[PDB]
Write a protein that holds these residues in place. Sequence first.
Motif, short mmCIF file in Angstrom:
data_model
loop_
_atom_site.label_atom_id
_atom_site.label_comp_id
_atom_site.label_asym_id
_atom_site.label_seq_id
_atom_site.Cartn_x
_atom_site.Cartn_y
_atom_site.Cartn_z
N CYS A 1 0.86 -1.18 0.00
CA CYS A 1 0.00 0.00 0.00
C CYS A 1 0.90 1.23 0.00
N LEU A 2 0.63 2.16 -0.91
CA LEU A 2 1.47 3.34 -1.11
C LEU A 2 0.67 4.60 -0.79
N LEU A 3 1.23 5.44 0.08
CA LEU A 3 0.70 6.77 0.37
C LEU A 3 1.70 7.76 -0.23
N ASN A 4 1.28 8.48 -1.27
CA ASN A 4 2.22 9.24 -2.10
C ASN A 4 2.04 10.74 -1.91
N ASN A 5 3.16 11.42 -1.67
CA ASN A 5 3.28 12.88 -1.72
C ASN A 5 2.26 13.56 -0.79
N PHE A 6 2.42 13.31 0.50
CA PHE A 6 1.52 13.90 1.48
C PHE A 6 2.29 14.78 2.47
N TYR A 7 1.52 15.60 3.20
CA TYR A 7 2.05 16.51 4.21
C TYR A 7 0.91 16.97 5.11
N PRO A 8 1.11 17.01 6.44
CA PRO A 8 2.33 16.71 7.20
C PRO A 8 2.66 15.23 7.32
N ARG A 9 3.70 14.89 8.10
CA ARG A 9 4.19 13.51 8.18
C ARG A 9 3.14 12.57 8.77
N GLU A 10 2.42 13.03 9.79
CA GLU A 10 1.12 12.50 10.21
C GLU A 10 0.49 11.52 9.23
N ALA A 11 0.39 10.25 9.60
CA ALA A 11 -0.24 9.26 8.72
C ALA A 11 -0.49 7.95 9.46
N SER A 12 -1.69 7.40 9.30
CA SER A 12 -2.04 6.12 9.90
C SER A 12 -2.63 5.22 8.82
N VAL A 13 -2.19 3.96 8.79
CA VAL A 13 -2.63 2.98 7.81
C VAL A 13 -3.22 1.80 8.57
N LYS A 14 -4.42 1.39 8.18
CA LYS A 14 -5.07 0.22 8.75
C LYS A 14 -5.34 -0.79 7.64
N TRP A 15 -5.11 -2.06 7.95
CA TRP A 15 -5.27 -3.15 6.99
C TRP A 15 -6.54 -3.92 7.31
N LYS A 16 -7.38 -4.12 6.29
CA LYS A 16 -8.63 -4.85 6.42
C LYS A 16 -8.66 -5.93 5.35
N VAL A 17 -8.78 -7.18 5.77
CA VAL A 17 -8.87 -8.30 4.85
C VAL A 17 -10.21 -8.99 5.08
N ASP A 18 -10.96 -9.19 3.99
CA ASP A 18 -12.29 -9.79 4.06
C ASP A 18 -13.17 -9.09 5.09
N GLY A 19 -13.03 -7.76 5.17
CA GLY A 19 -13.80 -6.95 6.09
C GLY A 19 -13.27 -6.88 7.51
N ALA A 20 -12.24 -7.65 7.85
CA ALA A 20 -11.76 -7.76 9.22
C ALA A 20 -10.47 -6.97 9.40
#
Lengths: 8, 223, 211
Positions: free
Chosen positions: C134-153
Amino acid sequence: AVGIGAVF
Amino acid sequence: VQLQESGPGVVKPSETLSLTCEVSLRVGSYYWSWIRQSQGQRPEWMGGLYSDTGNTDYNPSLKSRVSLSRDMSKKQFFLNLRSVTATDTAVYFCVSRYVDHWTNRRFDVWGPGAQVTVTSASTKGPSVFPLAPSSRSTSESTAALGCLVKDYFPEPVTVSWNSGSLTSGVHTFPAVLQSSGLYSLSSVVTVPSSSLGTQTYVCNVNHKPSNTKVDKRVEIKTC
Amino acid sequence: DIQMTQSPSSLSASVGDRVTVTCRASLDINKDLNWYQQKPGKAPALLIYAASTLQTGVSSRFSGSGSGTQFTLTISSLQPEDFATYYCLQDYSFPLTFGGGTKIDLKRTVAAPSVFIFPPSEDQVKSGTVSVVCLLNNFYPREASVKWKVDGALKTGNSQESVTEQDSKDNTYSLSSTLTLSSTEYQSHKVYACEVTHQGLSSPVTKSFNR
């Protein structure tokens, strides 16, 4: 407060 | 003053991590410590000693595994870290802390730091897999593609796109040591999605330590 | 052991700003706190010791204050060379412990990340172990949270993040979040989704694919 030497 | 760390950069797991610090030097006692720092983390003070006695203080998070000593005649002081695991991979600094009571200066001298990597891996060239822009992501105006670079050791790898002619929008992430004991990273780039189909895109992966070079063409998966 | 709680993890600033970094001790540490500047690949350099004493050779716009448990490092007129990570260090008692760090970077207008998700190619599926990127491209501020969901879970563990340094041209960051899975475990699920939260996004953006 700790871990600092001294030279003279 | 100047400090310099020295010792192997690779240590097999369960083995003992050993480093020397060469201390450059006029009448007194210094506190010499080892402070380490893993990528993306804060520094961790492992332990220190006073040079005149050799009496040690150890971080409780290691105590059983860490040993410090010094040899005043050789102007050296040492670190031994026993039964290391992959999480002992870090940059190790030796640092000297002492106040000159004549001039009232504080003095805080660090070595440049020695990276040590705990792994069973030998030298190995990388495997490269394409990160293809999906078929449906053509609705937007900007496309993303990349290459996954994995299973190589040691660092570094250099990544280019189209042999250097594509540099705008390139992002190559820092390498991360995998539980396999080898490194993995991705390199990506954003391009006009209208250029998908007319422009060829190739990532060039160079791994000098194994004298290996890999090229991988990255194209869309047409269904 | 005492531990410092450093705040903020990152802080956005412009050249010339007056900027504040804070450190909180779990116990009373008197004034035995030190401030360090660290640039990439380099050893930390001591800026302030004993809470407020400026170390020799350090520029005078660095200053420190506080005592007990609350301490502050202030950069009066931030210059380009001040962009770095800063650590506080207590030496009131053993073991010496460092704060979590504060990366001061160049301020720029907020940019939401463009998100892309990459299924593994068939070539990598045949190798027995796959990566989902999963790629989060060219963002600001550094602040970033990624959550992974597989088959809704919602899933946790496995995923690893890497981030580039602040880009020299547009002052943005990019982030990869990568799952590493055996080919068998990969094929034991249908839908993989990464869900991204950022200040530039009023609601989370999810990008997902079916295998």
